[PDB]
Every structure is written in C-alpha cells, then in structure tokens.
Design a protein around this ligand. Structure first.
Ligand code: SF4
Lengths: 283, 48, 67, 153, 161, 59, 132, 63, 58, 64, 58, 50, 142, 144, 120, 93, 72
C-alpha cells in the first residue's frame, strides 16, 4: 500500500543492525577461540621448555584444555568482599572485558582488509592499552588490599616507562612509514624487513615487545613470587578469566603489530635471496 | 577421543603388522588404553 | 659527528646537478608552500604562477604537458 | 559532587565527550591527540589521587549556602546578557538543497597536490611560520624542567 | 522436564571441573616438599591439569601439606572459608592427616579434620610423588562422579523425579 | 592471502614471547625505570638522530 | 552527463589527445594569478564546449568493448588506480584510435592473453605501490 | 685486564678490519647514491619524451 | 645496516615518486573533463538558487 | 656522579613533624600463605613506598 | 541545540565560573584547570574550523 | 491513558508518517536510503532510480 | 624483481605469466637494435649512464674482489679447520659480489632502455611501456 | 609583533618568575636556640607558590581566549594590521556587534590587571610580597 | 579514527558481554555456597587485615611522572615535523635539531641532578 | 629397522595439535573478516586515506552527486520534512 | 619402508595444503557467484554507445571474438 509502506522504514532497517551484531558476535567468538588456542600453545611451550609433557589428559592428548579452563572459570562462583564497594568491584571487570574485546577492531588482516577505515591504528591501539592499564590499576585500587595496591602501583610505574618507550619506538618507526595506518609499513617493507634498519635497536625492540606483552623481565603487575597474584589478588572466577583473556588478546595484537611493522609484515621474506634477486626487469 | 593412532604412526610397518595380527579394535584400543606418546604407540622402534 | 658528516656531504653535493643538489641547501616543497613563500617576494622574482600548472613561471619545467 | 574519584571520572567523561564533539566536527586527528594526552594526564592524576586521597573522604562542604547566596543569581545574570555570537546560525536555518559549495571540486588543484597526510598544516605552522613560537615553547619546557628539579630539591 | 538437558549439562560441568582442579599454592613442610616434587617435570601434574594457584579466591583444590599448630589453625580456617566454592580438600602427609610424629605435641593441632573439613587424605610421611598423584586422581574421579550420584529417584517414565 | 604469512609470523613472535617468559627472570622496578630513564631513551634518541642524518645524506 | 567516474575517466583519457582545442581553451580560461581557481561562471562557454566534445568522444568502436570492460574491471578492483591499469588503458586508447589496428593486434593474441583478466589487488600487490 | 700479546694482536686486527669495513660501507653508500641519481636522470628522460609542450600562461593573469 | 636500509628506503621512495609522476601525468590528461562536468554542475545549481532568490527578495 | 646522600636518608628529629614519617605506613604482612614466605613465617614488614622500613618476623607458626 | 560557537563560549565561561564554585581543594583545582585547558583547545579547534586559519589550529 | 496521552500519541504517529512519506515518495531515488524498500539492482549509469 | 619494470607495475592485481609474448618482445627488440646496429649516427645518439666496458668490468670483477675479501676475512678471524663455516663465508662473499655485478648490469640495461627510449619507434615504445608485444607485430612476427 | 608571540614570551616570563620564586631559601641561619625540639610550620613559600600559580593560570587562560577571539575577528594577530582593521570597522561599519568587541576588551584588560596584580585584585600581590626575600622583591618590582 | 560503525561495534561488544553474563548466570545456577564468618573478608594471607581504607603509598615517582608528561608533550610536538619530513628544508632541519638538542639537554639535566632515582 | 624421527624432532613435534588449532582459528577469523569486507562491496575497497586527493575526488564524485546534488537540483517547497530529521550537510558545523 | 622425513612430510602437507587452499579461497563455495557477478559487470554492446563510424559492426565483432576465442 502507498500509505502502508512508509511505516516500515526503521522496521526493515532493524534486521540489518541485527545481522551486523551477529557478524560482530561471530568475530568475537573467533577471537576468543584464537585466544584460547594461544593459551594452549603457551602452556605446551612452557611444558616443553621445562622438559614436561604438559596437558595430555584433557580429551584426546589434551587437545581441549582451553575449553575446559574457560568452562571451569565460568563454573566457579565469585563473592564480593563486604569491605569494598560492590559497584566498583563489579564495574572494573565489566569495563576491562568490554575494553578487551574492542582490540579486534583495530586490526588489519591484509591490504585494506580491515573492519573499519581507521587511519590511526597506532593511536587506537595506544588508547586501548591505556584503558587496559587504567582498568588494571583500578581493579588493584578497588580491592582495598595492600598487595593489590602495590601491584597497581607497580603496573602504573611500568605504564609510564611503557608509554614513553612505545612513543619513541613508534616515532622512530613512523619516520619511515609516514602514516598511522598499518598498511604503509608493510608497503615499504616488501624489499627487506624493517628490523634490518633497526638492527642495532633489536635489543630495544625485543624489550618493547616483552613490555607491550607484559612478559618478563617486564613481568610486573603479576609478581607471582613478589606480590603473589597480580591485580586479581582478591578477584577470581570470571574477573580473573576476563583479565587473563584480555592479557592474551593484548599479547596477540602486539605480536601482530610488531610483525606488521618490523618483521616484514605479511610479505614473504626475500632478504635471504637478496644476492640473487633482481631489481628491475627491463623487458 | 578421535585419532588415537595418527597417520604418521599409522604409516609404519609396525602399525600394519599389529592391525593384521590383533585387529582394528585392538589397534585402536591401545591408543585409548595406555596413551603415553603418539610416537610411543605400540613401542618406539618402527620395525614392529 | 653524524651531523657534521651530513653537513659536509651536503656542502660537497654542490658539484652534483641541480636535481642532485642537497635538499637542505636547495628546498623542494609542495606547490602550496612554493606559492605562499614566493608570492610578491622580490628576492627570488619567481614571475607569474600558472594556475593550470600550479607553479611559478620562472620555475624550471613549469607547465610541461603532454604534446 | 565533592568526591575526588568521582570528579576525575566526570572529567574523563567530559574529555571523551569533547573528543566526540571534535570527531563530529571532522577533526579526528586533534581529537585523537587530545584523547591520548588526556588519558596520560588522567593516569598521572589517578596515581596522585591514590597517593594523596587514598581514603577518598572529601571535605564536608554544602553547596546550598554558596549556590543560593551568590552563585545562582550571578549565573543567571551572566548567561542573560553575554552573547558574543555575531553571525553564527544553526544548520537548520535554511534548507540544505540551497547549498552547493560542497559539491564543487578542484580537479586541477587535486592533480597538482601531492599531500597524503593531514599533518601538512601542522608542519607548515609549527615549522615554517611559528618557528619562533616553537623555539619559545622548547625553551619554556627546558626552564620548566629545571624549575621542577629545583622544586623537588 | 528439566533433567534431560541437565544430565548432559551435569556431565559437561563435571568434566570441566575435573579438568581444572587447580591446587592451592600453600605448602608447609616435608609433605609439601614432596608435593612440590610432584609438580616437577618428571611428575607431570599438568598432564591431569593441576596448576598451582596462589590466591584462595581463585583456587579450587586445597592441598593441605604440612603440620598444623596452634599458631596456624585460625589462619587455615580463614583460608578455607576464603577458598572459592566449590572446593575440595586433600591433606597430604601424616602431620596433615593426624599429626604424625607430633601427635602428642602441645603445639600440634592434633588433626586437620578438627579444624577444616577434609575430603581426602594421603597416608605417607612423606607420601611419594606417585602417592600424591594417585590421591589427586582419586579425588578428581570422585569429584567427576559426585556431580550426578543418582540422588534423585527415577519416575515410571525413567525420569529423575 | 597474506593473512597466512601474517599468522605464521605472529605465531613465531608468540612462541618467542612464551620462551622469554619461561627463561628470563624478573628485574627490579627502580632498575628497569632507571634503565629507561638513563640509557634506553638516550639510545633511542641517538638512533633517531642517526637515522635523520642518514636520510639527509640520502635525501 | 550520465556516466560513472571510472567510465568517464576512461573516456576522457581516450579523448585526452582528441579534445585538444576545447581542452586548451578551457585551461586558458582557467588561468589565474593565484592557485585559487577562478569562479566557474567565468568559463561557461569553454566548459560547455569541453563537455560537448567529451560527449561526442564517448562513442567508441565495437572492438573496444572488451578492452573497455577489462579496463573497467581493473579500475573497480583497484578502486580507480589508473597507473596500475596502464596496460589495459593504453590498449583501450589504441583501440579507440584505430579499431582496425587493434583488431589486427588482437589477431596475434596469446593463450594466456586470451584468458579472462582476473584482477585481485590483495593476492597480487605489484612493486612499490604508493597507492596501496 | 692484562691481555696477552696474541690477544692484543687480534684486537688490533679487529680494529683495523672494523675501520676498513666502515670506510667500505661509506664508499658503497656514496656509490649507491650516485647510481640512484643516474637512475633518476634516466627516468626523467624517459618521462619527458613526449611531454615537451610548453603553453604560455594567458595574459589574463596579471602580475 | 642502518645506512644501507636508509639508502634502500630512499631508492624505493624515488621509484614510487616516478610512478606517481606517471600517475599525475595521466590524471592531468583526465583533469579537463571532470573539471568541466563539475563546473557545469556548479553553474546549473547557481542559476536555480539565483532565480529563487531573485523571485524571493523582489 | 654527584652526591645524593640527602635523597637517601630521612632521620626523625625530636617532635619534628617534618622529620617524622609523614605517610600512612602500609603495615602489610608477608603472612604464612604466601608463595615467597616459605609458608611458616609472618614477616610483618613496615614498608614505605615498596621499600621495607621495619621488620618484625612472627615465627613459630610451624613450631612442633 | 545551541550553535557551536555559542555553546563553546558558554561552556568556557561556565567552566571558569565553576572553577571557583566547588570547595577549595588543590587537586580539584588542578583537575578543573586541566578541563579548562582542554575546553580552550576544543574552542581553538572549532574556531580554526570556522575561519580556516592555520595559526588558529597550531 | 488520558486525553494528553492520546494527543501526544497522535502527534507522534502523524510525525512519523509524514517523515516516512516524505522520505519515500518525495525524494530523488539515486541513493539507497530505504532498506527492503529501495532496490538493490546494480546500476550502470550515473543516475538510476532506486 | 624488487622494484620491477620502470614502465609498469610487475603484477598490480593480475599476475601475467605469458612467456610467448615476452619472447616475442625480446626478439622484436633484438631485431630493432640489429636493424640500426650499423648506423653510426644512431650509435652515437645512443647514450647510457654507464659505459658497456665499465659495466662488463664491474660484472666480471665484483665476484673476484668479494671472494678475495671473504678469503681475507676467513684468514683474519676464522680458524681454517672449519670447512663448513669457511665455505659458507666465502660463498656469501661471492654471492654479494655477484649481486653487485648484477645490479650494475641492470642499471646499465635500464639506462640503455630509458636514455634511448626517445629514439624508439612508436609501436616499439608502446610495447616497452605496456610490456605487450602486440603493439609491434612486424618486428617479431617475421 | 603579534599577540601570539607576546603571549608566548609572557608565559615564558611567568615561568621564569615562578622558577625564581622557587629558588628562595626556606631555612636561614639564626641564633634562635629555643626552637630546637619544636616544629614551626611556616606557610609563606607555599602560599606564594599557590597564589602565583593560580593567578598565572587564570591570566594565561584569559589571554588565550582573547587571542582566539581576536584572530576570528580580523584574521590576523599582528600589531599594525589589527589596528588598521579596527579603524576600518569604525569607517565601514561592517561589524556593528559592539558586544563582542566589549567582551574582548574586557577580557584583555582583566587579564592584564590580573597579571600585573592591579587593583581591586591586590590581595594576591600583597600576599606575594609578604613572603619573599628583599632581593627577590626588588627583582620582581623591576621586572613588573 | 572511529565512526558510527565503531559506535555500533561497541554496542555489539556490550551485547556479547551480556551473553557472557547470561553464561555466567547459567554456570552459577549449578553451585551452592554457604555464608562463612570470613567469607566476605579481605584476603591477607590468612589473617584479618589491619586496615580498610587507610592504604596510602609514598609516591616516590612524582618527578618521574612530571618528566614523563613533559617528554610526552615534547614527543607530540616533534611528531608533526617527522610526519611530513619528505618536504624538509634547511630551517626545518635546524628547528628539528634544536628541538632534539633541547630534549637531550633536558634529559641530561634531569640525570645530572640524580632526580631519576627514588628518594626516601 | 626403527624409522623414528630424532629425539629433538619429536620433542618439538609434541606441539603440532595446538599449533594447527591456532592456525585453524586464525584462518577462520581472517576468512570471516575477508568475507565481511568483500560481500558488501563485491571487493576489498581501498581506504580513502590511502588514495591521493585526485583519487579521493574521483572516487566519491558519484556518491556525492547521488546523495546531495540530486536532491538539491530538484528541491520542492513542500519536499522538506516537517520534522528536523532531514539529511545533514556534507560539512557538520 | 618409510623414512623419518618421508613420514613427517605427510603431516606437514596435511597442515599446509588445506590451509593454503583456505587462504587462497576465503570466500568458499561463492567463487562461482563472484564470477557470475563479474561477468554481469562487463557491459554488453547495447548498454554502451557505439560510434557511427566504427571499423567493425556488432556482428563482425562477435564473429571475430568467436574466431579468436577470447575468454572475456
Ligand atoms: S607427615 Fe612426615 S613428612 Fe609430612 S610434614 Fe610431618 S614429619 Fe614431615
């Protein structure tokens, strides 16, 4: 009907929003599965280095340890201590988890292959890292425990050095790319890997990679021997699960960024056959 | 619980001899019986 | 020391051609900057600015288009 | 609100809203830069708050006395007469169908422009024209660092 | 009509809870030294999935390993209460079982069961790493089985009523 | 697509990170800060200055 | 006045050597003392002549249909990167200039050149492309 | 550190080799720059093959 | 390695510049027709608004 | 380097509020159930800025 | 609602007023000063957008 | 409800109907602005009715 | 190729793998160069950034100097009882020398094909720019 | 030659003044032997620092607002061109919005009075002079 | 640097979080917890914590934070110049070198005063 | 004979399942992202930020003409909707 | 009868070849639809304007395309 068609504009539009949300949920589930696989790989590598067999009874040859870990993390209950503000104690995990899944947005899987056309991928990543650090510090502070407060203080101390180091590394890297998009770095890295120019800064690059992933010797805010558990001294169950998942996603994203910007990106390494590779094909 | 004996382990004369001798049920059940290593399924030597 | 070596190299690059002259000692910027910094300036006397070519008339290779 | 933590949260929310407003005006570069700077400043401020206001118990101050005494009439009078808008108009003042400046394009100018970054105005300002201002800013920063060291001593 | 899905759900939950029986990083004496040796590469508790957790709020298995004294019983009770639910308890070593050599000591708790509820006990003083592994495996099997122990009776339609 | 190569490189980097976590110890907070506050920042700045000089030499 | 961006660009590149008189007249009318362009109302006649010439030149020879389709596919895959499609664009321009000579060149086609030109700017990247 | 005579000779050889390698690298960079300049000249010559048209600006544009 | 990488980056930039020069030549070859179409659009819209304003303010 | 003794020492003077420990002492304890406390020690350590100021080791937690 | 320039000016003036409205805490004063500086930067960006001036954006 | 509620509901319904009718029947259908109402056919010319 | 052809992109979005066209284009270029090979005026008009003798000397001596440098390096710091390491070092030095020679030769060829690109026929220049032998059939068909 | 350079130089001068104020000695050698086991809490230096910092912040905000408003008015912040444009406005009457001009002038004058400590804003300067050394006071007076 | 697409993505992320919350509720449906005396008390390695809100730090990194803010400002200032270094000039090079020298002098002066170390 | 792999080879090979699972998950995520990018536009459209001024102007000309120029050229006095829910301008003021 | 390298190659091939195919074809099972869409994206003769003075007519062009057997 000429008069009935008008009332269906937003009614027909809503299904598109539903489909977009479904696609985003599918992407989030895929990212969670990737993070679980990364955790499984980390456990296997730690066992192998320690001359241990590691997880082998979780299903067939321990192939589903990550799924069981996630289900058990869901299973265990969580009780908020009466000595702390329940509102903040709950909002910190939810905010951290919401910030954690947003890392998938600022990620490119190919040439112009991105969810959004963000020209400042580095800025977005830095903002996400700052938000994650703030969330960790708040979780440490809201716990009202001296150990959690010390852990939050150590994490904040790491962040100031982390921020300066990341800014200097980006500035030295942006000196070649001249763009905040990740594609420009890989575009000019097809000849040789960017680590070649930063050959003498390889140690500092490794230090930045270990700090951006919050791994040792920048393993502060964990302090297993020093301050027992990290910001999750009193946080457990779903809170600790979300924190660990965010840490793993941040590690994966930092490794992806480091590869895209320094290790030749997604271009095959032709540096080995440079002596036999031609420059121009004149007819 | 699938693939008690992998293709790499199944691609040996030992696997064929054991399957022909003890049958498919026994060949598959050993991996589910005392799984210690995928390369140690039925022994470490591949001759038998 | 690196800065001194770079300055020495730039000063020695005078024997190189005009395109090969040092960019520090011979500026090469965008058309907008060239028009802004050389308009109504008697030191250079860059002449007219061809709006079609967006370059000064006295600038070499100005308006070179396909035959 | 007198709670310092809540004040800081509200400041962060206001900064986020200002960044959103800047993005609405299609100024995303400055929005991102301000967002990063404000995030760093907020982290420092949170560290300071944990340092100096760990308990968080704000002073027992009542806003009613000062608000009713002078603040409300003063705000009313100030907002009543202050109007520095001369010719600014709302976007809904005229139909958008009567505007055609955003449709014209300079094809030759685009063909003569090699700029691929939005930082060209920033470079041309803080490096060519306002170079004296940049040098003054650097000298002021050095002097401020020296002053901070002396204050710490 | 809620037990049909619940039974598969109960089985999945039991498998998941058995797969992440994380022991508490809380050890005291030679029994705990043996337990730590049971965390070594040679004794792969990671094969069964036992990873030590430092925080009781994030732990599920309480490995009470050591001697309990009058100066530690309230702390043990507080830790047991602070342990996140559901929780299991395993007392390794004779001291953790019943005091052992110090069963007649004035500064001995005279049994860990009188302080906190204990689910499983290990006999050796010190128990071998194999003994601790066997005890952990038995506790895991019990936890997997205890989830659906057939408490409910089946109706005439073979449904738990 | 290049996504497979990117995934392989990221996996190598993650394995390296896991190995580093397994191998090296944890330093002191003040020690790491001073290393950043006295050596690393200066080294990075010198590298940037050398890169600028090289770019000027190579135009 | 009813053409898409890529098609109009291809037609103008083909007519870049054919509309010289009107193009030069309009460019002279577009001259100014500053980089700021002149008011468009100044050159209504020259712009009209250029548009008329472009409309008269948009009618290509039948042999140029396949080349035009290939160039359109290359531009769509490249999102309008002309330099990356230089070979197909040059071939289409030669076809428009001389359909007979282009037909003769098409007679001497290779087996690989006789296959469908499938362009994918993701798997295939080129060599040191700034527009990427 | 009271290094031996053989160690001192090795150190001297290493220093001489380092100096020679630095000089060679600088010479190679200069040669690469010259080659790049030559290639740029060749590319300009190739580009300006049929772009030699120079139309004077119209007199309508004032000084 | 730093010096060699800087030189290689400079050479890559020069090659990209040559490619961009070719692209700019092509775009200048395509400059006139698009500019003419845009000018026709701007002038046609100017006539309608001018006529509406002249009828209005009269 | 230069002298930095004043930046490392802070003695307390009689009735001098400035010379006192002008900060809330974080009386945290390395209690029994800690990974690094060896299990049988409660080292009540007055730590100032993550730096231990005073030590009081509660021992005898495992005295048998 | 209100035009952007008017909103920005009114917000700057209200922030300047509110800087004195709240209680006298040094930390609160510092936070308010930071907020005012951010508002000034936003106003400068809006003005540079309005007038298209490079120095205003600088 | 109430007379004021009925008046407000009628005003909102009339506003929605007027806006939708203006967007649908009075608009150059050159841009895809109405999902499930505007056609998804692939156009070849610059100006195609959607 | 690291940089590819200067006249077109190596494989922008479609990778062309036709060897018959490339062979025909090479034959056409050889025939064009042979037709005016005895033209003294055309020979003098041909100019290159690098001389043929210099290019040949570089391509023939670069591996030798690199091999000598590698042998000297193996003598300076490497023990002579490590056959694998010594051979690897020598091979790497020889490969670097060969790379330098190949770069010199490629530069000479590119300069010859570019500084003399203005003397090419119309169809020959079209083929060189587009990389397609279909532009000039008479120089390669017969 | 322009209000931007003037603002930058004035901010630099204010920072230098604050640094000089921070360079004041807190303790002095005195023969007061009775105060050896008692604490005397003197807040003169802290008050001076707080007052200087707050006044400088307010003045800088006012000057920045004035510069931003002036730039939009004429398009330049230089000395001669601004005066020429303002005098032209009095002859062409293009901008009759005297409210905006009055607000800009009020902002500039208030900022100048606050920076100079002009009355009725004088308790700030009174407290500033009450807690400084004699040579510091002499230098501040000579500068201002 | 973001758009309504990013806003809708944030909304979908919130929806996924709600799904996770539903999963958490479903998991918690299969557990029973009995209240304990110290169940909701602070975990301090087995003993009652002697503080509730009075958890204050010494804050020995104030100079470090201030220097970090100053260095971030300096780096942000230097960023625009390097963003378009392709069109560098003699004055641009001089200004960049002056800024670099100023940053280096500031860092050295900070180190020269031993202000980069923690203090009691 | 025993055709077992080397001991280091097996020790490193006791990770292949986890490595393959990670690779499969990453490939699935990447394929989902690629499908999302490609299905709406029938290709992987290049970012406008990676295109020059001329390229950006050429790309958006048709969209600008369809969404703005057409309504502005055939406007009617009654065409504007009675509410404020009209199309926003190309430049937000 | 199988080398350690020969047996190990099977698992590597299984891990690589399916992964290579998946990476080369992210849009699984829709390649035919994409090809059909691309073919429909090639405008026909009637959809475009042909010059009056064209060397070859439409029928001649079709015959020449059939003879040359261009895939198009
Ligand atoms: S039971 Fe035996 S081994 Fe265990 S702590 Fe007591 S004495 Fe030691």
């Amino acid at each position: 009907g000429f008069w009935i068609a008008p009332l269906f504009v937003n009614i027909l539009s809503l299904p598109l929003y539903l489909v977009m949300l479904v696609y985003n949920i599918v992407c989030m589930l895929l990212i969670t599965l990737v993070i679980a696989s990364i955790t499984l790989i980390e456990r296997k590598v730690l066992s192998l280095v320690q001359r241990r067999v590691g997880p082998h009874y979780v299903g067939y040859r321990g192939r589903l340890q990550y799924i069981a870990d996630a289900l058990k993390l869901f299973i265990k209950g969580i009780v908020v201590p009466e000595g702390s503000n329940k509102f903040w104690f709950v909002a910190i995990p939810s905010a951290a988890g919401a910030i954690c899944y947003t890392f998938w947005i600022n990620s490119m899987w190919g040439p112009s292959v991105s969810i959004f056309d963000l020209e400042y991928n580095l800025v977005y990543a830095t903002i996400l890292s700052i938000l994650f650090s703030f969330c960790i510090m708040l979780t440490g502070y809201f716990s009202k425990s001296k150990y959690a407060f010390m852990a939050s203080i150590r994490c904040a101390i790491l962040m100031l050095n982390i921020e300066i180091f990341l800014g200097l590394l980006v500035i030295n890297l942006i000196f070649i790319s001249e763009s905040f998009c990740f594609s420009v770095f890989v575009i000019y890295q097809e000849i040789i890997w960017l680590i070649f120019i930063f050959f003498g800064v390889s140690g500092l690059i490794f230090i930045t990679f270990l700090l951006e992933t919050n791994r040792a010797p920048f393993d502060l805010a964990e302090a297993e021997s020093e301050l027992v558990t990290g910001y999750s001294v009193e946080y457990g169950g779903f809170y600790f699960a979300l924190y660990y998942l965010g840490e793993y996603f941040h590690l994966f994203f930092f490794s992806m960024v480091i590869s895209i910007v320094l290790f030749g990106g997604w271009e095959l390494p032709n540096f080995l056959y440079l002596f036999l590779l031609n420059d121009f094909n004149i007819l | 619980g699938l693939w008690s004996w992998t293709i790499n382990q199944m691609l040996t004369p030992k696997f064929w001899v054991h399957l022909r001798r003890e049958g498919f049920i026994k060949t598959w059940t050993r991996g589910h019986k005392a799984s210690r290593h995928a390369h140690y399924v039925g022994g470490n030597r591949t001759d038998g | 020391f690196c800065l001194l070596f770079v300055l020495a190299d730039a000063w020695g690059r005078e024997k190189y051609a005009q395109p090969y002259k040092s960019q520090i000692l011979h500026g090469r910027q965008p058309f907008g900057h060239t028009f802004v910094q050389n308009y109504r300036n008697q030191a250079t006397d860059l002449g007219r600015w061809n709006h079609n070519f967006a370059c000064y008339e006295k600038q070499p290779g100005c308006g070179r288009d396909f035959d | 609100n007198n709670n310092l933590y809540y004040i800081l949260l509200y400041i962060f929310l206001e900064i986020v809203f200002f960044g959103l407003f800047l993005c609405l005006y299609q100024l995303e570069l400055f929005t991102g830069f301000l967002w990063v700077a404000e995030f760093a400043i907020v982290f420092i401020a949170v560290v300071l708050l944990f340092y100096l206001n760990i308990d968080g118990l704000h002073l027992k101050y009542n806003h009613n006395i000062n608000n009713v005494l002078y603040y409300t009439p003063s705000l009313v009078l100030f907002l009543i007469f202050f109007n520095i808008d001369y010719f600014s108009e709302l976007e809904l003042f005229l139909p958008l169908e009567l505007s055609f400046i955003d449709i014209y394009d300079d094809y030759y100018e685009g063909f003569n422009n090699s700029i691929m970054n939005d930082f060209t105005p920033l470079t041309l300002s803080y490096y060519s024209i306002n170079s004296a201002e940049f040098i003054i800013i650097g000298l002021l920063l050095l002097l401020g660092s020296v002053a901070c060291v002396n204050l710490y001593k | 009509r809620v037990d049909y899905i619940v039974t598969p759900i109960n089985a999945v939950v039991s498998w998941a809870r058995q797969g992440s029986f994380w022991p508490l990083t809380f050890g005291l004496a030679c029994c705990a030294v043996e337990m730590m040796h049971a965390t070594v590469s040679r004794y792969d508790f990671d094969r069964f999935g036992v990873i030590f957790r430092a925080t009781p709020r994030q732990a599920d298995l309480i490995l009470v390993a050591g001697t309990l004294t009058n100066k530690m019983a309230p702390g043990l009770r507080r830790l047991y209460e602070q342990t996140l639910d559901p929780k299991w308890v395993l007392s390794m070593g004779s001291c953790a079982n019943g005091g052992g050599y110090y069963h007649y000591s004035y500064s001995v708790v005279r049994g860990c069961n009188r302080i906190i509820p204990v689910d499983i006990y290990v006999p050796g003083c010190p128990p071998t790493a194999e003994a601790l592994m066997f005890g952990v495996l038995q506790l895991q099997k019990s936890l997997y089985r205890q989830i659906n122990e057939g408490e409910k009776k089946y109706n005439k339609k073979d449904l738990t009523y | 697509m290049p996504y497979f190569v990117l995934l392989f490189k990221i996996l190598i980097f993650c394995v390296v990170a896991i190995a580093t976590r397994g191998t090296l110890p944890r330093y002191r907070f003040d020690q790491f800060t001073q290393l950043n506050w006295k050596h690393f920042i200066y080294i990075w700045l010198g590298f940037l200055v050398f890169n600028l000089c090289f770019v000027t030499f190579f135009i | 006045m009813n053409t898409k961006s890529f098609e109009v660009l291809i037609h103008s590149q083909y007519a870049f050597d054919v509309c010289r008189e009107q193009v030069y007249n309009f460019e002279d009318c577009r001259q100014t003392d500053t980089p700021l362009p002149k008011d468009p109302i100044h050159c209504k006649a020259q712009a009209k002549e250029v548009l008329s010439c472009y409309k008269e030149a948009e009618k290509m020879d039948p042999i140029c249909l396949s080349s035009f389709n290939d160039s359109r596919e290359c531009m769509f895959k490249s999102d309008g990167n002309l330099y990356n499609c230089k070979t197909w664009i040059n071939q289409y321009v030669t076809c428009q200039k001389n359909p007979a000579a282009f037909a003769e060149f098409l007679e001497a086609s290779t087996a690989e050149q006789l296959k469908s030109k499938k362009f994918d700017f993701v798997k295939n990247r080129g060599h040191s492309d700034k527009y990427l | 550190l009271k290094h031996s005579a053989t160690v001192l000779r090795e150190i001297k050889k290493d220093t001489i080799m380092m100096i020679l390698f630095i000089i060679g690298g600088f010479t190679y960079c200069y040669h690469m720059r010259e080659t790049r300049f030559q290639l740029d000249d060749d590319f300009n010559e190739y580009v300006n093959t049929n772009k030699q048209t120079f139309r004077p600006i119209p007199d309508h544009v004032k000084l | 390695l730093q010096m060699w990488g800087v030189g290689k980056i400079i050479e890559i930039k020069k090659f990209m510049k040559r490619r961009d020069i070719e692209l700019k030549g092509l775009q200048r070859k395509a400059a006139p027709f698009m500019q003419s179409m845009n000018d026709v659009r701007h002038l046609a819209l100017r006539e309608r608004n001018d006529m509406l304003y002249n009828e209005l303010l009269s | 380097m230069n002298r930095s003794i004043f930046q490392l020492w802070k003695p307390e003077s009689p009735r001098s509020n400035v010379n006192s420990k002008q900060i809330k002492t974080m009386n945290v304890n390395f209690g029994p159930q800690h990974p690094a406390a060896h299990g049988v020690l409660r080292l009540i350590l007055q730590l100032n800025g993550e730096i231990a100021e005073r030590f009081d080791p509660h021992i005898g937690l495992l005295h048998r | 609602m209100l035009t952007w320039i008017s909103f920005w000016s009114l917000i700057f003036w209200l922030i300047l007023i509110i800087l004195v409205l709240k209680p006298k805490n040094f930390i609160s004063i510092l936070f308010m000063s930071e907020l005012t500086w951010l508002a000034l930067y936003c106003l400068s960006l809006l003005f540079g957008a309005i007038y298209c001036d490079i120095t205003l954006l600088s | 409800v109430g007379p004021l509620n009925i008046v407000f509901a009628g005003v909102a319904f009339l506003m929605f109907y007027e806006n939708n009718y203006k967007k649908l029947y009075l608009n150059p259908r050159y841009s895809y602005t109405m999902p499930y109402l505007q056609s998804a056919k692939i156009t070849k010319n610059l100006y195609e009715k959607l | 190729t690291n940089f590819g052809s200067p006249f077109r992109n190596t494989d922008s979005g479609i990778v062309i793998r036709d060897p018959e066209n490339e062979k025909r284009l090479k034959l056409a270029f050889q025939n064009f160069w042979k037709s005016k090979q005895e033209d003294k005026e055309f020979q003098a008009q041909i100019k290159t950034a690098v001389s043929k003798d210099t290019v040949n000397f570089m391509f023939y001596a670069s591996p030798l100097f690199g091999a000598l440098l590698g042998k000297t390096y193996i003598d300076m710091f490497c023990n002579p009882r490590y056959f694998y390491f010594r051979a690897f070092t020598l091979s790497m030095f020889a490969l670097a020398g060969y790379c330098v020679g190949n770069g010199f030769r490629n530069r000479y060829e590119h300069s010859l094909y570019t500084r003399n690109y203005h003397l090419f026929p119309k169809d020959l220049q079209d083929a060189l720019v587009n990389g397609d032998a279909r532009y000039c059939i008479s120089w390669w068909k017969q | 030659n322009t209000l931007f350079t003037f603002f930058f130089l004035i901010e630099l001068v204010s920072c230098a003044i604050f640094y000089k104020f921070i360079v004041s000695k807190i303790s002095f050698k005195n023969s007061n032997y009775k105060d050896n086991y008692f604490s005397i809490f003197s807040k003169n230096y802290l008050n001076v620092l707080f007052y200087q910092y707050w006044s400088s912040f307010f003045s800088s905000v006012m000057i920045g607002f004035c510069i931003i408003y002036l730039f939009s008015l004429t398009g330049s912040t230089e000395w001669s061109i601004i005066n020429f444009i303002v005098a032209s406005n009095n002859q062409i009457n293009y901008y009759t919005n005297n409210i905006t001009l009055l607000f800009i002038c009020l902002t500039l004058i208030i900022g100048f009075i606050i920076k100079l400590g002009i009355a009725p804003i004088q308790l700030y300067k009174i407290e500033i002079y009450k807690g400084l050394p004699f040579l510091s006071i002499f230098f501040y007076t000579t500068f201002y | 640097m973001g758009d309504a697409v990013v806003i809708h993505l944030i909304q979908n992320v919130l929806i996924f979080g709600i799904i996770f919350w539903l999963l958490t509720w479903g998991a918690e449906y299969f557990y029973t917890v009995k209240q304990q005396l110290t169940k909701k008390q602070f975990y301090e390695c087995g003993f009652k914590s002697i503080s509730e809100l009075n958890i204050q730090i010494n804050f020995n990194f104030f100079m470090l934070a201030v220097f970090l803010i100053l260095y971030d400002v300096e780096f942000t200032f230097l960023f625009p110049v390097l963003f378009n270094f392709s069109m560098f000039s003699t004055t641009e090079l001089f200004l960049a070198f002056f800024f670099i020298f100023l940053i280096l002098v500031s860092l050295l002066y900070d180190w020269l005063n031993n202000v980069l170390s923690w203090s009691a | 004979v025993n055709t077992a792999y080397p001991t280091p080879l097996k020790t490193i090979l006791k990770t292949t399942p986890a490595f393959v699972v990670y690779f499969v998950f990453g490939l699935g995520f990447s394929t989902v992202i690629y499908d999302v990018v490609y299905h709406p536009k029938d290709r992987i459209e290049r970012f406008y930020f990676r295109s020059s001024k001329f390229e950006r102007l050429s790309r958006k000309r048709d969209e600008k003409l369809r969404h703005y120029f057409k309504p502005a050229i055939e406007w009617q006095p009654w065409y504007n909707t009675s509410t404020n829910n009209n199309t926003r301008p190309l430049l937000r003021y | 009868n199988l080398p350690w390298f020969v047996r190990w190659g099977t698992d590597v091939a299984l891990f690589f070849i399916p992964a290579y195919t998946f990476a080369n074809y992210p849009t699984t099972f829709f390649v035919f639809a994409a090809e059909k869409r691309r073919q429909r994206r090639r405008k026909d003769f009637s959809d475009v304007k042909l010059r009056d003075d064209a060397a070859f007519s439409v029928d001649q062009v079709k015959q020449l395309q059939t003879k040359l057997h261009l895939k198009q």
